[PDB]
């Protein structure tokens, strides 16, 4: 019952994800940072948005409230977490 | 020891022994869907079995010459492999 | 119908079946060696199955929509895929 998916995370699991999801026939969306500008993920999504232009490259990626503002912004109806950046987060399932 | 409540990095390992695929599966979860169904098309318990075996390796930018750590740069050549056997989920890596 | 006394171009998809690499194996015939030995290790006639399915084609530059006849000149522009279960084999496909 899901009709697009976003990515919380970067690099090769989020191609992995966007490789599963597309398979399903579901649409695909990714978030990149300041020095994510040129990242592979980026590209081999449908919709690729810029997450925190103020904030940091790192802290971009870790960024609860503005990673749903993107989300929200976009009918997305599902959220890949991946691992290793808020995958393990409770309040962001929440 | 612990519990990892997500996928890790070295589940691509599994996924060729076993057949099935794990961040597929995933999505097929968060849709409600059964394990056993038509759509995931997961085996039963005695029926999933390994298939020979799998080795994985992380390629990073470290070496122990500065003992294991980053540097930065464009990537000038960058050569891959692919065939049989050999399973590729890249992602960093290109051009340059 | 008829034999073929030699490997096939979808030799590929059996191998990821089975699990056995045709091409090492044959090599390794030719080199005197038992397929119940040492150097190839191939599980004896039932201890083999077919682990789920899989599916080949090639990609040619014969025209669909012109009766077939393939296109020959300079390709411009190139990206493969790769990703878990899908063994790629590039012949003269190249970014250039």
């Known amino acids: 019952q899901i009709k697009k998916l976003l990515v919380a995370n970067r690099g090769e699991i989020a191609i992995r994800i966007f490789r599963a999801a597309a398979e399903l026939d579901i649409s695909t969306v990714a978030i990149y940072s300041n020095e994510d500008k040129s990242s592979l993920h980026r590209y081999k999504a449908d919709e690729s948005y810029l997450v925190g232009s103020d904030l940091g490259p790192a802290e971009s990626y870790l960024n609860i409230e503005r990673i749903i503002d993107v989300a929200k912004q976009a009918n997305v109806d599902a959220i890949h977490p991946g691992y290793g950046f808020l995958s393990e987060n409770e309040q962001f399932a929440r | 020891i612990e519990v990892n409540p997500r996928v ?18 995933q999505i097929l979860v968060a849709a409600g869907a ?15 079995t390994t298939l020979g075996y799998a080795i994985q390796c992380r390629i990073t930018t470290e070496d122990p010459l500065n003992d294991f750590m980053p540097d930065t740069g464009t990537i000038i050549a960058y050569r891959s492999s692919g065939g049989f056997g050999v399973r590729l989920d890249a992602g960093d890596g290109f051009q340059g």
């Open chain 2, 34 to 48: 059964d394990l056993f169904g038509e759509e995931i098309n997961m085996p039963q318990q005695k029926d999933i």
């Open chain 2, 8 to 25: 890790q990095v070295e589940h691509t390992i599994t996924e060729m022994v076993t057949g099935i695929d794990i961040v597929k599966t």
